Amino acid sequence: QVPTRKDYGSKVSLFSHLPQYSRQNSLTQFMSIPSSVIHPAMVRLGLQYSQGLVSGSNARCIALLRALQQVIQDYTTPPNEELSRDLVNKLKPYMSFLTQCRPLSASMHNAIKFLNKEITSVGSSKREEEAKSELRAAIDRYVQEKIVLAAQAISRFAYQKISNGDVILVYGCSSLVSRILQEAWTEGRRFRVVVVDSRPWLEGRHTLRSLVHAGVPASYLLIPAASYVLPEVSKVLLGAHALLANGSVMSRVGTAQLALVARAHNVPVLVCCETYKFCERVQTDAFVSNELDDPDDLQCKRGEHVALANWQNHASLRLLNLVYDVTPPELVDLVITELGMIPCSSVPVVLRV
Amino acid sequence: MDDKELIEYFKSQMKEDPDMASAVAAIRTLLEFLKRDKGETIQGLRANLTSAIETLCGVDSSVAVSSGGELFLRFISLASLEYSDYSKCKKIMIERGELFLRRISLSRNKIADLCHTFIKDGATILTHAYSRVVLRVLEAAVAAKKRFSVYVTESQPDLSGKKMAKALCHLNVPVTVVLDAAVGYIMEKADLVIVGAEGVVENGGIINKIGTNQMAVCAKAQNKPFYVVAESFKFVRLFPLNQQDVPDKFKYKEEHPWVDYTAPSLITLLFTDLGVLTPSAVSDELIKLYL
Amino acid sequence: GSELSERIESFVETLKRGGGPRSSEEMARETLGLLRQIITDHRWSNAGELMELIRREGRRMTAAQPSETTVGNMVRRVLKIIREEYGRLHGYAQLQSNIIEAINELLVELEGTMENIAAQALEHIHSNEVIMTIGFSRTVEAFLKEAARKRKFHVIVAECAPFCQGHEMAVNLSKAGIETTVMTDAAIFAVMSRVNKVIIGTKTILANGALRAVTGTHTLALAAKHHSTPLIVCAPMFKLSPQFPNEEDSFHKFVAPEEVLPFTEGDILEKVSVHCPVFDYVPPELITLFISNIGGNAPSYIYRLMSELYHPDDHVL
Amino acid sequence: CRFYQHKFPEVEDVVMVNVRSIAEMGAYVSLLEYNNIEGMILLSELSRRRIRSINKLIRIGRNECVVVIRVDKEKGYIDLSKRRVSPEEAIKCEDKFTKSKTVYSILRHVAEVLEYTKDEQLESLFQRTAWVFDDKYKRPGYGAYDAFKHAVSDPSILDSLDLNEDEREVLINNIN
């Protein structure tokens, strides 16, 4: 089937059960060149998941759905097989390939679960190509009316909670918040923005540029100085990777601590998320479900010396950097979604049904 | 027809009786307006109701009346119409309105016999304002023969808490009209807090007379319980995050507000005619009540 | 016919005093057996008549020992089921057998809630950890020696004082190689700084997550609100009740004062008004995460579940 | 322009409307059967179950059939529905909608060769030409379509009421 990627050196004692992956030793070194054992769309999409060319959540979900559509409408039926079975069996190894390449988010898992429900929902009364086009149009209509129309409704809602004068705090390359701002700024409301980024995957700069190029006065500053600007900040507008069952909004590694000092200075947090980033497992602390991207990139060029050149030759040393933290539902005060505005401790009683 | 007598009839009814709350008089005025509609449409009524609501939001600004109008206009169009001749619609809609106003009327009685089991006999009710629902809660808490001392803060913007104190000691309860500035003091000896409610925002904390929020946090200071009683039609879909976020048509009516917001992390339980709710449940039942 | 009444009286009596059925599973199970017996071996024209009858018998069964509501919530759920079947057959002929098959479904689910919780366990624990419980519930010991056969954590159980009940667990779990440490309840806080999470049982989950557990846990809920270590409440879904916390505080179970101050003490028992409650109330806000045979949940989902199972009208039972 | 020379739509008629908003008591959407009428398709019982409708702004734009359950054009009141229509009326309404689309497109592209001074010129030209043709075809709505479809045989079908040279020019240019 598919080989397995190596572990990159020492993990954290508490996080041994999680993978210490590496974004250099890509799997595609040892596959079939004119990919047949693997689809071309899957080898390509995984290969560009390992090269970071897809970062956000909506971005990963859309890239996944596009590559899966390219798999679908380039697939013929083996002898005497109903689509509902052979297709999902064809799908499983590709999803395992992706999960081997870059551990899937909640958006990828939501899309995969929906796509399994759809592949199995196709019938025997429908011919091959007609029902294949049906599933194709189903993927398309979902990826439209549950993410893009979603974000537009999120804008129509959030526009209410941005009055004239109040600055706003955000975090990193969460596409939804940039759209919220560049959509509620044209309609008149005026404000500022205080983007906040971290290391070494510095990713506030993306929303920074997308805010500069929209006429919105920004101001960028690393998160070990967030405690500074929180006096002024009147709303925090976090991008919410994945809601959870209890209400604990999992998001990027800063979101939690940011909401912490935010509630400390008593500024009302607002995480923005859509009604499909709701993988309904639960995760009490921040450790029972995370990842670990290539940690060997934390280092920084400092004059002539980089303090971690020989990362490994210091045995008892180990590095890490999570890629997901979690805000418990005490801190957060808004879940803006296409259902309206719901308090964070009431995520499940309205998103389970 | 027009406000020229609609508003006058509204004021006359709402001021015929103090136990008659405000927004229920608003509902009754909307109903009599329907009973004097003289028109042929439904759309024009989905607009004329909003017209009456916007001429009602001036004579009264309390969240009560906006909630009543919006929720009533919502629920009235719930039993699928499939219009016949703009008359079957009339009968079924006035029937829905009659049923809704009767639900409204018995809301207070239901919340009365649902609340009275919470004053642990020999305790200290600490109310905050003349509030018909808290009044007819304490009445059914002394009718079931418990005993309790009641501290009614005075609500400085208008010394009306004294009205609650008088009408309450009319029922032979040990009343003590504290200084509304002293809600940091008597909170050492308040076994529970029963504040009247004038509308609930989504997340659970409520809009209430100015001196509520402080009292609210004082509760959470000294780990006392904080109990509210929101009549059934006191739900609105705002969602403030700080006392300035609430609409300006609500607060005012030098610079000093009249109502303000108690965050939900302070309220321990809510008592509505929809039962007993931890605030998350009021978010849920507000979404699924407006529908 | 009279066999009905005799097993009713046997049940009521062994309820008032009888130690055992031990696991609340077993209490609910024999309750369900008695429910089946009542609901097949009696006379009723309409279904509402059976609603009224079983309401009477449940009222007696609960007002017998109101300190235990597993039987009460079982009665309320059975009343929900009769409401369901009457609604289905109204919008009368053989609905009896429909009742019985739904009850058999309920019972086969009940018989496996423990393994549901077991399978859900391992997604919350990982090695190099220390976990703290209190008292003794069969659910928690299943949980722990289930998660034990994959990895070896360090459990710290705090023996309750009114009964060294936790002691038993600390023996049982010591029979899975699980690093059990027994501490005296008083010393909870003394080690509360090195307990990564707590796993507490219950005997009720009131209608706002305000569980009511074995005594010596409100202190645990507060010492884990303090350190912000989380409360895994391992409460099988059938332990709920639509009752709310502030109700007349005949709420604990005031066991005989011989547990605390033995009778052989002496004269000082003239005016020493000893006390002994075995149920500590716990408030919602301290409760972090509920487990149940459905999955994981938040103390705000409990009202959804209560409006789900027990038809909100029969809370008065 | 106004695709029908009648004052208001017909009683128990069938029109196609573009769902725009999702209001409280009914979707306040717009159609064109009487120069962009504004109807309120009343939300039903299990249709009001949109309380959990993913992106309740759905139907932001889409065509859908609606029958005029009640009407009073004294000020522009129309109350539609969505459960009184069936695939027969649905197919017929699709037919009438396609016909109105083609007719309006042809007529607008034709009168576009004149750059009318004001909308009153559009109304007068439409009235005269299309209304005369449809009334001669002994059917309201089924007249201009049949006329523009028979103009594929001889563009002087109704040359007795000869409208103008630019009309026949553009018509035989980009219709037949």
B82 and D83 in contact (C-beta within 8 Å)? yes
Task: Round to whole Å and give the CA distance between A319 and A317.
Answer: 7
Give yes or no for a contact between B207 and B63, defined as CB atoms under 8 angstroms apart: yes
Element (H, E) at B248: helix B248-251
Contact A153 D52 (CB under 8 A): no
Query: Which alpha helices (H) appear in C65-112, and where do they start and end?
Result: 70-88, 95-110
In angstroms, what separates the C-alpha of A189 from chain B's closest C-alpha?
A: 15
Give B-chain residues touching D23 at CB under 8 angstroms. 46
D91 interfaces chain B, CB cutoff of 8 Å: no
Cα angle at A167 between A163 and A168, to 5 degrees? 95
In angstroms, the separation between the Cα of residue D57 and the nearest Cα of chain A is 7
Q: Is the separation of the CB atoms in A319 and A295 below 8 Å?
A: yes
d(CA B66, CA B37): 21
Do the chains contact at B280 and A345, CB–CB below 8 Å?
yes
Q: Does any CB of chain B come closer than 8 Å to the CB of residue D51?
A: yes
Distance CA A208, CA B40 (A): 56
* Identity of the residue in B82, B86, B291 whose CB atom sits nearest the CB atom of D81: B82
Assess contact for D51 and B287: CB atoms under 8 A.
yes
CB A272 within 8 A of CB A238: yes
Measure Cα distances from D33 to A299, D3, D29 in Å: 68, 6, 13
Q: Residue A345's closest chain C neighbor by CA? A: C300
Question: In the sheet where A269-272 sits, what is the strand order?
Answer: A236-239, A269-272, A335-337, A340-342
Query: Closest by alpha carbon to A191, among A210, A163, A219?
Result: A163
Q: What share of chain D is helix, strand, coil (3-state, %, to 5)?
A: 40, 15, 45
* Beta-bridge partner residues of C211: C205
For chain A, positions 147-166, list CB contacts with chain B under 8 A: 161
**Beta carbons within 8 Å of D26's beta carbon, 6+ residues apart:** B42, B43, B46, B77, D40, D41, D42, D43
**Chain A residues whose beta carbon lies within 8 Å of the beta carbon of residue D57:** 149, 152-153, 156, 338
For residue C44, report the phi and psi dihedrals to the nearest 5 degrees: -165, 130
Distance CA A63, CA A42 (A): 10
A317: left (phi over 0), alpha (psi -120 to 50) or beta: beta
Instruction: Report the residue from A145, A156, A339 with minimal CB separation from D52.
Output: A339
Encoded tokens for C247: 């109700």
Helices (H) and strands (E) in chain C, counts: 11, 10
List of residues 6+ apart from A244 with CB closer than 8 A: A250, A278, A279, A280, A281, A282, A283, A326, A347
Backbone angles phi, psi at D77, to 5 degrees: -95, 130
Q: Is A83 on the interface with D (CB under 8 A)?
A: no
Secondary structure of residue C198 in the 3-state scheme: strand
Q: How far apart are the C-alpha atoms of B104 and B99, rounded to whole Å? A: 9
Rounded to whole angstroms, the Cα distance separating B243 from B251 reads 9
Structure-block tokens of residue B256: 């000093």
Residues whose CB is less than 8 angstroms from the CB of residue B213 and which lie 6 or more positions away in sequence, other chains included: B243, B260, B261, B262
Minimal C-alpha gap between C241 and chain A (Å): 18
Tell how far CA C193 is from the center of its chain: 28
Residue C213's SS3 state is strand
| Residues of B whose CB is below 8 A from A330 | 265
A280, A288, A346: residue with CB nearest C300 = A346
* Residue whose pair of structure tokens reads 């989950």 in the numeric block: C205
Of A146, A152, A275, the CB nearest to D57: A152
How does strand D26-31 pair with strand D15-18? antiparallel
**What is the spatial distance between Cα B205 and Cα C129, in angstroms, rounded to a whole number?**
38
Task: Report whether C260 contacts C274 (CB < 8 A).
Answer: yes
- For residue B268, give how far its alpha carbon lies from the nearest alpha carbon of chain C (Å): 9
Q: Which residues of B touch A270 (CB under 8 A)?
A: 241
Chain B hits for A235, Cβ within 8 Å: 241
Neighbours of chain D (3+ CB pairs under 8 A): A, B
Give dist(CA A345, CA A349) in Å, integer: 9
Give the distance from residue A108's alpha carbon to the nearest chain B alpha carbon, in angstroms: 28
Q: Report which of A223, A269, A266 is spatially closest to residue A249, judged by C-alpha positions.
A: A269
Nearest to B250 by CA among B67, B50, B74, B21: B67
Element (H, E) at B32: helix B22-34
Q: What is d(CA C167, CA A139) in angstroms, rounded to the nearest whole number?
A: 57
Euclidean distance between CA atoms B138 and C199, whole angstroms: 40
Q: Do B83 and D48 touch (CB under 8 A)?
A: no
| Pair C78, C33: CB distance under 8 Å | no
Would you say the C-alpha torsion C106, C112, C117, C123 has a positive or negative sign? negative
Residue D30's φ and ψ, nearest 5 degrees, are -130, 145
Point out which residues pair with A340 in neighbouring strands: A337
SS3 for B126? Answer: strand
Across the interface, whether the CB atoms of D79 and B288 are under 8 A apart is answered: no
Q: Quickly tell me which residue has 């569980």 as its tokens.
A: C211
Contact assessment for residue A72 and residue A139, using Cβ atoms and an 8 Å cutoff: yes
Contacts of A274 (CB under 8 A, 6+ apart): A146, A147, A150, A151, A154, A176, A337, A338
Backbone angles phi, psi at B143, to 5 degrees: -70, -40
How many Å apart are CA A7 and CA D150, to the nearest integer?
Answer: 76
What letter does residue B277 receive in the DSSP assignment?
A: E
Distance (Å, rounded) from C-alpha C195 to C-alpha B274? 40
Render C253-275 in DSSP notation, one character per residue. Answer: -B--TTTTS-GGG-GGGGT----
Q: How far are the Cα atoms of A318, A320, B163, B170, C194 from residue A16, in angstroms, in the given order?
A: 12, 11, 67, 71, 20
DSSP class of residue C240 equals B
CA geometry: angle at C55 spanning C53 and C60, to 5°? Answer: 100
Q: Using CA atoms, how far apart are residues B226 and B217, in angstroms rounded to an integer? A: 9
Type of residue at D124: S
Task: Report the distance separating Cα A331 and Cα C236, nearest Å.
Answer: 28
| Spatial contact of A348 and C300, defined as CB atoms under 8 Å apart | yes
What are residue C159's DSSP bridge partners?
C184
| Residue B283: CB atoms within 10 Å | 27
From C209, C299, C303, residue closest to B277, measured CB to CB: C303
Contacts of B8 (CB under 8 A, 6+ apart): none
Residue of chain C with shortest Cα separation from A344 = C300
Strand order in the sheet with B175-176: B175-176, B148-152, B123-127, B192-196, B226-229, B269-272, B275-277
Question: What are the residues facing C205 on neighbouring strands?
Answer: C211, C240
Domains of chain B and any CATH numbers: 3-109 (1.20.120.1070), 110-288 (3.40.50.10470)
- Closest-CA residue in chain C for B281? C303
Q: State which residue of chain A sits closest to B237, comparing Cα positions.
A: A341
- Residue B51 falls in which region: left (phi positive, over 0), alpha (psi -120 to 50) or beta: alpha
Query: Cα–Cα distance between A236 and B279 in angstroms, integer?
Result: 23
> What is the C-alpha to C-alpha distance for residues C6 and C174, in angstroms, rounded to an integer?
42
Q: What secondary structure, in 3-state letters, does chain A show?
A: CCCCCCCCCCCCHHHCCCCCCCCCCCHHHHCCCCCCCCCHHHHHHHHHHHCCCCCCHHHHHHHHHHHHHHHHCCCCCCCCCCHHHHHHHHHHHHHHHHHHHCCCCHHHHHHHHHHHHHHHHCCCCCCHHHHHHHHHHHHHHHHHHHHHHHHHHHHHHHHHHCCCCCCCECCCCCHHHHHHHHHHCCCCCCCCEECEECCCCCCCHHHHHHHHCCCCCECCEEHHHHHHHCCCCCCEEEECCECCCCCCEEECCCHHHHHHHHHHCCCCEEEECCCCCCCCCCCCCCCCCCCECCHHHCCCCECCECCCCCCCCCCCCCCCCECCEEECCCCCCCEEECCEEECHHHCHHHHCC
CB C246 within 8 A of CB C207: no
Picking from B202, B242, B284, the nearest residue to A268 by CB comes out as B242
Task: Check CB contact under 8 Å for D51 and B42.
Answer: no
Question: CA of A32, closest CA in chain C: separation in Å?
Answer: 36
* Residue D15: strand pairing partners: D66
